Structure 1
Amino acid sequence: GLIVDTRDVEERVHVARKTKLAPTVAHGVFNPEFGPAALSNKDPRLNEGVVLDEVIFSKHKGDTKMSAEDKALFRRCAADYASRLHSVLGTANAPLSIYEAIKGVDGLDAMEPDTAPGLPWALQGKRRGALIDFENGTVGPEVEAALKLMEKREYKFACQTFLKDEIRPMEKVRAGKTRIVDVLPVEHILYTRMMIGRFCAQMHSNNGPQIGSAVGCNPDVDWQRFGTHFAQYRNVWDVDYSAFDANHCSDAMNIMFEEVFRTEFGFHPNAEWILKTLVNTEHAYENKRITVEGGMPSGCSATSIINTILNNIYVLYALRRHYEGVELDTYTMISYGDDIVVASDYDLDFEALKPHFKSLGQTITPADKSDKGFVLGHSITDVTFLKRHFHMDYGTGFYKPVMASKTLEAILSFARRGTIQEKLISVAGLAVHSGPDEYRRLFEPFQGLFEIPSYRSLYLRWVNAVCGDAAAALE
């Protein structure tokens, strides 16, 4: 987005400063080129003379304005995808009750009861539990008063910027490219869930190529579904974006919201209104307040869904801007926010689409670094989706999500205090797909120290997970 104003200010929102991610015994063995993001501006691991506060917001390069003709084209694409979407999900998009929005429904998990509340509550020193009753599914006066302002479209808010405490490639650590998290007020999250929660629930439940969304999928089971779909196409592309979230233009966001969340598709009028409050935002980071036009706040309710929907419209838009007679049948895709796999029998030229995506403010590049440009004839077994390759399991003949051993090494190399046992169990569920020898090697550092699930036990669990009756081949 475009920074329009950055006045310094009285009140101060102090972040975090130091990581909770401490090295494990595995770190000494694998010595990964990965470490915790820089959270302090004076982190010695940083490159000298590189201030952390600058690079955080460098992603805000501007808010691409589109022509009348590009907007009408985009409107057509948004409406075309919307048609497909609401056809599959139905039109029961009436507001969720307060209770439902808090407690969730089938396809939509309940709100986190003790996550950050946002502004202005964090300046008062107050937790989510004080504002909202998560067991009961009810709200205090302050939230109800905010609820009332949103009804009448008079509600205004600020986003609380947090530095993301996570493992990053050391190049990005040293370059100070710590990701941020735009924390919205808990009431904003609540109302958004009220306005579009059922839609979201339906999306999650209906995940797959048809709606072009993997939000809600379970890679253990769904890799067989997705893998077999995409293997039917002659060409598959693995597309990377540069700062996807920041670079959604005001025009694209507004038109997408206008076409997808219409009252004629069952939504309350304020579905459109509440989503449109994400366009022009005020961000609070320490003593500064930054006003941004364009871009999606990473950490609002349904950020993943909104990004996924945009991804879908972008691909349609870019193809129709370059080629003639392009429809939704012309290709297939699945995305998860900025992450995307696209396939087609037509030999599309994604190199030629680069400028057409640029007209939206988005920079596409191939997922592999080498080979200067996009290439034809790539298959499903060459691409990364959700940091997972599609490899055929030779025991069952099903697709399994394989993570790169270097990534698993990095994950296993760091942990927060007193979680190591728990993390190992969780990560073993990722690592089983790398096969027995690699599984043994990844956990070898932890032997004698923690309980490591046997390879065999997780393999049988998985064989049941994918279908179930494949397990019931007792010969």
Structure 2
Amino acid sequence: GALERLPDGPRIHVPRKTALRPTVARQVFQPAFAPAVLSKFDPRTDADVDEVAFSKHTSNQETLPPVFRMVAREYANRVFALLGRDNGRLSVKQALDGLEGMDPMDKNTSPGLPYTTLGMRRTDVVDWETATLIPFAAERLEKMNNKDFSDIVYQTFLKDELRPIEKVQAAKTRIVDVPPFEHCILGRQLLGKFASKFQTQPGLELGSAIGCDPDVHWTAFGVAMQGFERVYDVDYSNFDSTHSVAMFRLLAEEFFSEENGFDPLVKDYLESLAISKHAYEEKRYLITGGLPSGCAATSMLNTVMNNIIIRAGLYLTYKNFEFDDVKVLSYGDDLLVATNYQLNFDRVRTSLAKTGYKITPANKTSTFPLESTLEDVVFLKRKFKKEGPLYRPVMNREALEAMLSYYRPGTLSEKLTSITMLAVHSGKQEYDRLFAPFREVGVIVPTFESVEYRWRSLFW
């Protein structure tokens, strides 16, 4: 919200060509999907894609009800009771290498401005052996330690991916925000030690599916939500952008605070996300509110806010409502409510509408069903398919066809390998149907029994 125009500067090229190309299986399945619109002169749409991206960000909420604060600090108590309040700053060595049971920073990811303009990669700007930034990058990280984030400009561009034909026709393409590499390092310094603990324990108590593995953890999520009377599926609309600047303050003061064992600089880092400066072609602008993408923190941040927001809506809608009445499971804006009560999310939608957040039923029709169970819900594009004492992540049939219909030249073998581990849960008949197009044109893929056996090996 609140997009303020700044003085224009050097041209930072937004890419306007898809790398996606159709496979041999596109003609077979013909999914309701196509590459996202990137150019203004894309003939598949009437609309200007830059206008549609800039039409969003109207204005976030200035204020926010007082119930958001108490439910935030009450959620904080539960989280830090389990994980602990030893969430101090990590060294630059620890940030790059990552802690034990935490992936190291990706060397391939974009380094951000001005390194992308100069044609440099992440491994140019730092030495991973010694954890040593080059003089230019080192002094910028120094200034951010001294409470100054004035140099930080997000490289912003359109997301190259598949979209529904309606999103392609309407030119509604998602926006990627790439922060500078030093900003991304500093983020993992301040919030890394906490993130490592949050990743390792996904479940209903922490209220998060972050750092899970659908093959294994679906059985754990399944059995945990099994005993409950109902399970609701709730989806937000523009969850990242609708975060108010007040929400960021709440997190800094109540959740990611020095009381809970965080670095004092965390507050200033969170303000860099709250009020951020972006570069798009020659345009420069300033968005007040909403969480930018980029780096590993984004999914965790939304997961924390999601547990707060959904309960705050319930507190507002349902009087004498309890915190433990609802058990939550979420991976960012993908939300899953488990409860013994009977909740009406039509009235919760109207409550949260006033607070800025917009929920939807996730079933293409404006009616949250009063009755809903574990078998009905869809979480992470997957369903909960019980099989003996286990649960299998059965992925949507229309999703699987869409994934196989397009690809990026060069990395086709890597793609097919990963999709076999998804399609295995749909059954041998469905499995061999989905890969038949590729085998038809002389492309070998592993047997169903090979990959099905591999999945069963996880539980031995």
Question: Shared topology, TM-score over 0.5?
Answer: yes
| 1:178 paired residue number | 173
Task: Tell me whether 1:13 sits opposite 2:12 in the alignment.
Answer: yes
Task: Tell me whether 1:305 sits opposite 2:272 in the alignment.
Answer: no
Amino acid at match of 1:437: Q
Task: Tell me whether 1:432 sits opposite 2:390 in the alignment.
Answer: no
| 1:460 paired residue number | 453
Unaligned runs of 5+ in 2: none
Question: Number of residues paired by the alignment?
Answer: 458
Unaligned runs of 5+ in 1: 469-475
Residues 38 and 176, structure 1, Cα contact 8 Å, conserved in 2: yes
Amino acid at match of 1:126: M
Identity %: 43
Q: After the TM superposition, which residues 59-458 of structure 1 pair with which residues of structure 2 at under 5 Å, given as runs?
A: 59-67=56-64, 70=65, 72-156=66-150, 157-370=152-365, 372-393=366-387, 396-447=388-439, 449-458=442-451
Residues 9 and 284, structure 2, Cα contact 8 Å, conserved in 1: no
CA–CA distance in 1 between the matches of 2:62 and 2:139?
36
CA–CA distance in 2 between the matches of 1:123 and 1:360?
39
Residues 234 and 377, structure 1, Cα contact 8 Å, conserved in 2: no
Residues 182 and 300, structure 1, Cα contact 8 Å, conserved in 2: no
CA–CA distance in 1 between the matches of 2:225 and 2:354?
28
CA–CA distance in 1 between the matches of 2:188 and 2:58?
30
Describe the superposition over 1:17-67 as per-residue Cα deviations: whole angstroms up to 9, x where unpaired.
111111111112111111111111111222x2x111011133313111225
Q: Given the superposition, is the C-alpha separation of residues 195 and 7 from structure 1 closer, same or farther in structure 2, using an over 3 Å criterion?
A: closer
Amino acid at match of 1:353: V
Residues 17 and 40, structure 1, Cα contact 8 Å, conserved in 2: yes
Amino acid at match of 2:9: E
CA–CA distance in 2 between the matches of 1:216 and 1:447?
34
| 1:472 paired residue number | none
Partner of 1:292, secondary structure, is: strand
Residues 179 and 294, structure 2, Cα contact 8 Å, conserved in 1: yes
Deviation at 1:105, TM superposition (A): 1.4
Describe the superposition over 1:107-144 as per-residue Cα deviations: whole angstroms up to 9, x where unpaired.
32111113211123333332222211234433222222
Deviation at 1:169, TM superposition (A): 1.0
Residues 149 and 272, structure 2, Cα contact 8 Å, conserved in 1: no
| 2:29 paired residue number | 30
Q: Which piece of structure 1 moves more, 218-227 or 447-456?
A: 447-456
Deviation at 1:294, TM superposition (A): 0.6
Residues 279 and 296, structure 1, Cα contact 8 Å, conserved in 2: yes
Partner of 1:359, secondary structure, is: helix
Deviation at 1:76, TM superposition (A): 0.8
| 1:473 paired residue number | none
Deviation at 1:87, TM superposition (A): 0.8
Amino acid at match of 2:266: A
Partner of 1:329, secondary structure, is: coil
CA–CA distance in 1 between the matches of 2:435 and 2:108?
32
Q: Which piece of structure 1 moves more, 123-132 or 342-351?
A: 123-132
Q: Given the two structures, how large is their TM-score scaled by the length of structure 1?
A: 0.93
Runs of 4+ with >3 A deviation: none
CA–CA distance in 1 between the matches of 2:353 and 2:34?
33
Q: Given the superposition, is the C-alpha separation of residues 376 and 324 from structure 1 closer, same or farther in structure 2, using an over 3 Å criterion?
A: same
CA–CA distance in 2 between the matches of 1:89 and 1:304?
18
Describe the superposition over 1:253-303 as per-residue Cα deviations: whole angstroms up to 9, x where unpaired.
211222111112211101222122100111111011121111000224400
CA–CA distance in 1 between the matches of 2:107 and 2:225?
39
Q: Given the two structures, how large is their TM-score scaled by the length of structure 2?
A: 0.96
Amino acid at match of 1:2: A
Q: RMSD of the alignment, in Å?
A: 1.4
Deviation at 1:8, TM superposition (A): 5.4
Q: Which piece of structure 1 moves more, 230-239 or 192-201?
A: 230-239
Describe the superposition over 1:214-254 as per-residue Cα deviations: whole angstroms up to 9, x where unpaired.
11000111111111121212221111111000001111121
Q: Which piece of structure 1 moves more, 298-307 or 136-145?
A: 136-145
